Amino acid sequence: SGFRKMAFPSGKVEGCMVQVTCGTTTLNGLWLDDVVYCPRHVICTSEDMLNPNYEDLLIRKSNHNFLVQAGNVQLRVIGHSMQNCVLKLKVDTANPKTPKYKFVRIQPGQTFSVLACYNGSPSGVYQCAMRPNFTIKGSFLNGSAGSVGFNIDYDCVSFCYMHHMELPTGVHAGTDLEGNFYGPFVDRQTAQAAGTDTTITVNVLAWLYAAVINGDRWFLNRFTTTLNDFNLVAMKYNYEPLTQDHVDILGPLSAQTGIAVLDMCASLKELLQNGMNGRTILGSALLEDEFTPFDVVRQCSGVTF
């Protein structure tokens, strides 16, 4: 019993984190095979950031301008190139700790674990969702750029996020590991802001199923609804539309708990219209939306890696 915000074990990723320094700027890199990946803003001074021409700045750098540190070992950089908003520093040694991995770009609503790092050293791990507005509500300070997000499946680490920047509201933006930004953000020092967000409906439903599995049932009721009726309420309350694909994904949980998806939707609709009337669900007074249906299954069935 119990239900916690649970991250993937981070050991496979810890062995890949390095420190990357260029000039007086330091951040983290990801060492896989014989390439170190990091944010391309490591080559920028503060003045550069106002109007950077990254190709131009990179042309002036030599391989020895990148100091790459793996624990107490300096890695020898033998090439440098950029892909979108990441640098790829080729080094003369393949990382012997490289796990089975792939690079995957995720969609809003999907969750992942963040390995927060400073000076190339892992410092903390926590679970994040990609928000519908493509930011992440991370916990990051100066020096955290190049920290990565990932999921695991069986043997394979799927890297999905590399941290670049913090926005004025304190939420975070970054890229996939091919350097493509999530969200309409750029790696330039110019005015930028998170757009208005919404709540991830399918994840709230998953968490209601987790609550039922844990014995919290007070929000169940005799009613059902339809997709069209439910989505009118979702719009009114700045919830994402629920799709048929989402209903299908919840199928396991709905046949398991004994509660059909559109029955659970009628519970969520009542909670949106009336609140929780002083009660809590799984120790929360808010409707939690950073657990996917698979997150609930993995925790409640004890899946291992």
Partner: peptide
């Protein structure tokens, strides 16, 4: 503000 979260070496 907007912060690129490298650190000073």
């Amino acid at each position: 503000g907007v912060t690129f979260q490298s650190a000073v070496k």
